[PDB]
Design an enzyme around this catalytic site. Sequence first.
Site, mmCIF file in Angstrom:
data_model
loop_
_atom_site.group_PDB
_atom_site.id
_atom_site.type_symbol
_atom_site.label_atom_id
_atom_site.label_comp_id
_atom_site.label_asym_id
_atom_site.label_seq_id
_atom_site.Cartn_x
_atom_site.Cartn_y
_atom_site.Cartn_z
ATOM 1 N N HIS A 213 0.834 -1.220 0.000
ATOM 2 C CA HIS A 213 0.000 0.000 0.000
ATOM 3 C C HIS A 213 0.864 1.264 0.000
ATOM 4 O O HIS A 213 1.935 1.287 0.639
ATOM 5 C CB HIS A 213 -0.922 0.036 1.222
ATOM 6 C CG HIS A 213 -2.051 -0.950 1.164
ATOM 7 N ND1 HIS A 213 -1.858 -2.309 1.274
ATOM 8 C CD2 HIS A 213 -3.382 -0.770 1.003
ATOM 9 C CE1 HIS A 213 -3.028 -2.924 1.194
ATOM 10 N NE2 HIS A 213 -3.968 -2.013 1.022
ATOM 11 N N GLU B 31 -9.724 7.375 -3.563
ATOM 12 C CA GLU B 31 -9.868 7.285 -2.107
ATOM 13 C C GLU B 31 -9.117 8.387 -1.366
ATOM 14 O O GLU B 31 -9.666 9.026 -0.457
ATOM 15 C CB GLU B 31 -9.415 5.905 -1.607
ATOM 16 C CG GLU B 31 -10.354 4.780 -2.044
ATOM 17 C CD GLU B 31 -9.663 3.432 -2.122
ATOM 18 O OE1 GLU B 31 -8.469 3.329 -1.733
ATOM 19 O OE2 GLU B 31 -10.321 2.471 -2.582
ATOM 20 N N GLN C 103 -6.056 6.711 -5.806
ATOM 21 C CA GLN C 103 -6.183 8.133 -6.141
ATOM 22 C C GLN C 103 -7.559 8.668 -5.754
ATOM 23 O O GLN C 103 -7.661 9.727 -5.143
ATOM 24 C CB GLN C 103 -5.942 8.384 -7.631
ATOM 25 C CG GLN C 103 -6.211 9.835 -8.054
ATOM 26 C CD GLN C 103 -5.139 10.785 -7.552
ATOM 27 O OE1 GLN C 103 -3.980 10.395 -7.392
ATOM 28 N NE2 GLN C 103 -5.519 12.036 -7.299
ATOM 29 N N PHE D 208 1.202 2.856 7.228
ATOM 30 C CA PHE D 208 -0.100 3.142 7.836
ATOM 31 C C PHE D 208 -1.201 3.004 6.808
ATOM 32 O O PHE D 208 -1.262 3.740 5.812
ATOM 33 C CB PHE D 208 -0.139 4.559 8.417
ATOM 34 C CG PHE D 208 -1.464 4.930 9.027
ATOM 35 C CD1 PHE D 208 -1.829 4.433 10.273
ATOM 36 C CD2 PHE D 208 -2.336 5.790 8.370
ATOM 37 C CE1 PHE D 208 -3.057 4.771 10.843
ATOM 38 C CE2 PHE D 208 -3.566 6.136 8.944
ATOM 39 C CZ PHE D 208 -3.916 5.613 10.188
ATOM 40 N N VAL D 209 -2.093 2.061 7.076
ATOM 41 C CA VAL D 209 -3.211 1.776 6.204
ATOM 42 C C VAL D 209 -4.515 2.049 6.950
ATOM 43 O O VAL D 209 -4.703 1.595 8.081
ATOM 44 C CB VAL D 209 -3.161 0.316 5.721
ATOM 45 C CG1 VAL D 209 -4.460 -0.054 5.002
ATOM 46 C CG2 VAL D 209 -1.948 0.109 4.787
#
EC number: 4.1.1.97
Lengths: 164, 165
Positions: free
Chosen positions: A66, A86, A84, A118-119
């Site tokens: 990610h 999101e 993009q 960080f997701v």
Amino acid sequence: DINVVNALAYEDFVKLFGNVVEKCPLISAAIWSYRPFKDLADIEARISEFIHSLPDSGKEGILRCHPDLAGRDLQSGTLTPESQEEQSQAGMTTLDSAEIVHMYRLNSEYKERFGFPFVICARLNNKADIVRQLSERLKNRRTAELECAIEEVKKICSLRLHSI
Amino acid sequence: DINVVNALAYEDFVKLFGNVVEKCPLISAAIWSYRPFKDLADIEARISEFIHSLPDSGKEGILRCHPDLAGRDLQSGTLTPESQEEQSQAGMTTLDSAEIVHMYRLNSEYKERFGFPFVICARLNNKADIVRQLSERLKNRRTAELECAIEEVKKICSLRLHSIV
């Protein structure tokens, strides 16, 4: 229409579904083995089941596929079309100069601590709640954090599936 | 230098090794968790153990990430750099119309039977070798062919790794 989905060649299934988990077409390609699907919920469950079967390194691996929120890929227009849309919806493309510097610092600290990006499910969060979660989750133990982050991946997947 | 590799951030590790298994950066990203690597053989071993740990559907998934030899992606110029180089070495970029159509038919037959693409280490095979394997492997039971194809994936990986080196 799940009937049309169920009749897809694996090539076309992979093209359509190959980015529901960011840069992990393997996962969508894998679950085609379980067709025919009852409905989209069935596809969702199979994806979740697959992810959970992975070793912890596999889960960390998914995270590492990610891009950072507001980071190098956003800044250079090299996000996937879903990422993009999101990130833009969550306020990441209209951040001011101070906001960008702050996200860089937070991301840096997170990836240093945990060893993966960080997701978060951006579609379900705004700028403020993202900053809040970055700080909160930074305090988590690794084991608890990996679980938290994978849940976010699953939410993202669910929304991407339902956008197709 | 294994020391330079061992010191890479995951972003740089994934950039460099993210295509050693075709369109499966997840595999390279996962193995970074097991650093430091003793040597290249350790990297290969970790890749193999990871793949071996997946359900059969995961193994099929990996295969389904691979493009066909001489297929649409070759003709459209949309292969990954490694696949383009590999298929060129195996004579897939200089085929005539008859040959391109022949390959299409052979691939269609294989994929209909097995539900995944025909995968072979193209750097170790010529055009004639490929056609022969395409016809013999078609005879295999599905259980056995999945094992055979995954072995080819690991060979491709080994060579991709050695080319970075």
